[PDB]
Amino acid sequence: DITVTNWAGNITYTAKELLRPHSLDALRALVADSARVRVLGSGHSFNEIAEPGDGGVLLSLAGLPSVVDVDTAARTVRVGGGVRYAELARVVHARGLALPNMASLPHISVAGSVATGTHGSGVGNGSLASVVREVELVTADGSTVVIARGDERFGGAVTSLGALGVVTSLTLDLEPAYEMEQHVFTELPLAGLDPATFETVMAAAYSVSLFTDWRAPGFRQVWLKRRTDRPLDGFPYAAPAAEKMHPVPGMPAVNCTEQFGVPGPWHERLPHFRAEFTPSSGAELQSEYLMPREHALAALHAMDAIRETLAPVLQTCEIRTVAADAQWLSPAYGRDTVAAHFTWVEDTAAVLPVVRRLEEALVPFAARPHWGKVFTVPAGELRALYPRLADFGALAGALDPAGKFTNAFVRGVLA
Numbered sequence: 205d206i207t208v209t210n211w212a213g214n215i216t217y218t219a220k221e222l223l224r225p226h227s228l229d230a231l232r233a234l235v236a237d238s239a240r241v242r243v244l245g246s247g248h249s250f251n252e253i254a255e256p257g258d259g260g261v262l263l264s265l266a267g268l269p270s271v272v273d274v275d276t277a278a279r280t281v282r283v284g285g286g287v288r289y290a291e292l293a294r295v296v297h298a299r300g301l302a303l304p305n306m307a308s309l310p311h312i313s314v315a316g317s318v319a320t321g322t323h324g325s326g327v328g329n330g331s332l333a334s335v336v337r338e339v340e341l342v343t344a345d346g347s348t349v350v351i352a353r354g355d356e357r358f359g360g361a362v363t364s365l366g367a368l369g370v371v372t373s374l375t376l377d378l379e380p381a382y383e384m385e386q387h388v389f390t391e392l393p394l395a396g397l398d399p400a401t402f403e404t405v406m407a408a409a410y411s412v413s414l415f416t417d418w419r420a421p422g423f424r425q426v427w428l429k430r431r432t433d434r435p436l437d438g439f440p441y442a443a444p445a446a447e448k449m450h451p452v453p454g455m456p457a458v459n460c461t462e463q464f465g466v467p468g469p470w471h472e473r474l475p476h477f478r479a480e481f482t483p484s485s486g487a488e489l490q491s492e493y494l495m496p497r498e499h500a501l502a503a504l505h506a507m508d509a510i511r512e513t514l515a516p517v518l519q520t521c522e523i524r525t526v527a528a529d530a531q532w533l534s535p536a537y538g539r540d541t542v543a544a545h546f547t548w549v550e551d552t553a554a555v556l557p558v559v560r561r562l563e564e565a566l567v568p569f570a571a572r573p574h575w576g577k578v579f580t581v582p583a584g585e586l587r588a589l590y591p592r593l594a595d596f597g598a599l600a601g602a603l604d605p606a607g608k609f610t611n612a613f614v615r616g617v618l619a
């Protein structure tokens with residue numbers, strides 16, 4: 205017996221072994237011979253999404269080769285589902301190519317990241333799932349099904365909560381390698397941050413994040429990640445940082461990607477954390493809520509008005525933008541989006557009442573929770589938030605009629 209947990213350690217899985225097949229032949233046979241299956245990627249979810257239930261099989265792709273195969277003429281890369289972004293990015297950069305975005309920390313599986321709606325920031329930048337052009341699935345009976353952009357099912361095939369089968373490979377679209385500079389600023393007030401000024405701030409560079417502790421009024425930090433092949437206007441709205449910064453006040457800035465406007469390659473500037481920073485776990489919980497971009501300032505004012513409730517259990521809050529997603533279950537489905545992320549203290553009993561209060565404040569803004577993070581939004585409210593959820597339920601019924609890949613988390617959503 206071994207104990208398998210998620211990365212933060214707040215979720216302990218029921219599985220007494222983590223199965224790690226060493227060939228596709230073994231993987232197909234294992235899937236075909238198991239009654240219920242969920243896949244474990246890198247465990248950077250915070251809820252029971254990967255839990256297969258008692259007697260369910262928890263399987264990993266860590267025992268298969270981590271393939272990264274770039275076609276330079278086509279500007280595409282075929283990558284194993286268990287490959288993490290840090291390796292993917294190093295490889296494609298060495299071939300002269302690049303991705304349009306990355307999440308805050310690169311040591312996360314590509315298949316697991318796209319499964320839940322993972323994104324970075326920037327008003328013109330889609331989710332990480334949006335560059336995927338093809339997925340290859342091992343389905344419930346062990347057979348392989350390939351689904352590509354243009355297929356009428358493709359909208360449900362990438363961000364699928366792992367509910368269609370085991371993604372063994374994915375193919376992503378790439379662009380030429382590009383250089384970036386990161387400029388940090390401190391103390392951006394919320395007072396006077398009107399709709400025009402908010403839009404200007406969030407569009408001031410290729411990717412922009414705001415950070416706050418919800419203590420003193422306003423925002424503690426603003427991070428501008430600029431492409432050197434694009435203009436950068438003066439940024440008058442907050443003071444330039446005097447020191448290297450960490451998004452969480454009091455944590456080690458050495459861990460973070462280079463600042464002070466020093467040019468470097470895309471994959472060493474899009475993440476907030478440098479590749480050398482390799483935590484095996486973290487003492488944190490996370491939540492994030494994704495809303496129509498037009499509700500940004502109203503939502504920020506709702507949070508400000510309850511900030512004394514948020515602050516005591518908060519490490520940092522990060523505000524980002526995401527372009528509309530074509531994936532039916534993406535929290536960014538169908539609409540340009542503002543995202544409000546919370547990295548909490550790891551105290552489940554103190555955090556849940558605060559999450560409930562936060563969700564109540566955000567209800568009129570059609571807030572969709574990040575599938576990989578902590579939320580308490582009831583299932584019926586969830587279904588009402590996704591116009592194409594029925595299309596998804598139909599696709600899952602077609603590819604997995606016995607619900608082999610549906611666990612209690614997925615079942616609750618679809619019910």
Ligand SMILES: *Cc1cc2c(cc1C)nc1c(=O)[nH]c(=O)nc-1n2C[C@H](O)[C@H](O)[C@H](O)COP(=O)(O)OP(=O)(O)OC[C@H]1O[C@@H](n2cnc3c(N)ncnc32)[C@H](O)[C@@H]1O
Nearest residue numbers: 245246247248249285307308315316319322323366371576
């Ligand atoms: C821990 C963490 C999380 C995180 C982050 C930084 C850290 C330190 N930064 C993020 C960010 O900047 N933006 C964002 O949107 N999310 C961010 N996160 C969250 C994280 O990216 C997601 O929670 C992600 O889904 C985690 O992926 P991971 O692979 O680590 O997680 P998992 O629990 O094991 O799996 C999640 C789901 O995906 C399914 N899965 C995984 N592999 C497969 C394959 N090969 N086939 C089918 N399904 C797969 C799992 O079953 C589960 O449903």
Ligand SMILES: OC[C@@H](O)[C@@H](O)[C@H](O)[C@@H](O)CO
Nearest residue numbers: 308451452476520522545547
């Ligand atoms: O979506 C996760 C979020 O991006 C998180 O990684 C913060 O950036 C981090 O906790 C700040 O330290």
Ligand SMILES: [Cl-]
Nearest residue numbers: 394395421422
């Ligand atoms: Cl203010």
